[PDB]
Amino acid sequence: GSSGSSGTNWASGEDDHVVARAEYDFVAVSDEEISFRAGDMLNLALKEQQPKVRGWLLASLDGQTTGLIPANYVKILGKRRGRKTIESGPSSG
Numbered sequence: 001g002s003s004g005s006s007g008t009n010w011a012s013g014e015d016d017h018v019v020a021r022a023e024y025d026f027v028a029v030s031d032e033e034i035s036f037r038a039g040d041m042l043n044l045a046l047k048e049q050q051p052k053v054r055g056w057l058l059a060s061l062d063g064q065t066t067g068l069i070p071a072n073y074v075k076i077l078g079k080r081r082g083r084k085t086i087e088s089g090p091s092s093g
Helices: none
Strands: 020-022 057-060 067-069 074-076
Antiparallel strands (some): 020 074
């Protein structure tokens, strides 16, 4: 079929998301899953958005398409906040 969605642009970075680097290699068992190798940056959506499934975190390897990716297989480096927030308004020291 076709696709199309706005707002939640965490995958692109415009929205709040997390950063992680695949610790090892792992392919996609199904179409829903994504194939990534050790050394890729995957954007993980906040639990709020995350699906019901447990263990698998919803993230977009490339940035446009989102799929189910493993956690242990990936290592978190340092979550980041939305992009707009960048030089948007005032903030404490």
